Every structure is written in structure tokens, then in C-alpha cells.
Design a protein around this ligand. Structure first.
Ligand SMILES: [Zn+2]
Length: 142
């Protein structure tokens, strides 16, 4: 079935700006990660954990189902200029070994606990994953 929907945590709706770019109501957004956060009274179970494992499972669109994969978390990696954004450096990226296609973007990667990041980047035999951990209500401050 259709699994293409945004994520709502408590009162923060996280989604891809390059796939949403809504009005100017978005509370805060980080162009560096092309992620936006809006407000709403539609709280969901979506609660990013405090750990971002490496070997998990992401929703593979090529097989229309979750598949086991292994990505390595990186404090920051270079993102070659593309249709999304120009050349720069991102933060919290999980690069692994998997197929990539124009649409697979958005695949949530569940680990020992659960979703730890979605597909934000993709390359040859390599798939990046935006770590949602370093953003949610894990601690903040400092
Ligand atoms: Zn974990």
C-alpha cells in the first residue's frame, strides 16, 4: 500500500522541503538537511530514539517492503551539488550499501529500537540516511 507520508512528532511535522516546500508557516527548517518542521495538533507515535545503529532495515521501494541494510553514521559528509542542493557538508549521515532510485527517498530505517533516519542521499551502490536522532527530543541544550 501507499507509504508516502510525512512524520508528525507530538507537534512537530518533519518532512523533506524539496518534496513539500509549503507556505511560510514552517516554524523552523534547516536547508543544510532540506528538512522542515511545522506545527499541528496531530500527534503521532513517531518518536525518534536516542541511538542510531548501523545495521537496520529501510523501506525498499524497489521491492515494496522493508529490507535489511547496514549504514555507517558520519558526523558530516560532503554532498556533491545535485538537483537538491549545491556542494556542501551535511550532518548526521548514515551511508550504507544499497540501491538508489528517483523516488526511494523517504525510506525510514528501523533499527534495534526503531526508525533512526530516512533516505536523504543516494549514490552508486551507496545510500545515505539522515539521522533523526540528533534533532528530536534526545537532550538538546548545551
Ligand atoms: Zn539503535
Amino acid at each position: 500500500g501507499p507509504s508516502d507520508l510525512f512524520v508528525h512528532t507530538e507537534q512537530a511535522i518533519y518532512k523533506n522541503a524539496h518534496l513539500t516546500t509549503p507556505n511560510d508557516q514552517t516554524i523552523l527548517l534547516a536547508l543544510t538537511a532540506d528538512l522542515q518542521i511545522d506545527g499541528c495538533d496531530q500527534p503521532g507515535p513517531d518518536n525518534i530514539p536516542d541511538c542510531d545503529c548501523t545495521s537496520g532495515c529501510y523501506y525498499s521501494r524497489s521491492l515494496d517492503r522493508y529490507i535489511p541494510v547496514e549504514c555507517e553514521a558520519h558526523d558530516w559528509y560532503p554532498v556533491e551539488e545535485t538537483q537538491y542542493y549545491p556542494k556542501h557538508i551535511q550532518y548526521n549521515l548514515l551511508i550504507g550499501e544499497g540501491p538508489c532510485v528517483p523516488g526511494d527517498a523517504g525510506g525510514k530505517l528501523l533499527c534495534r529500537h526503531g526508525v533512526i533516519g530516512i533516505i536523504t542521499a543516494g549514490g552508486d551502490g551507496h545510500v545515505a540516511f539522515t539521522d533523526l536522532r540528533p534533532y528530536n527530543i534526545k537532550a538538546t541544550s548545551q
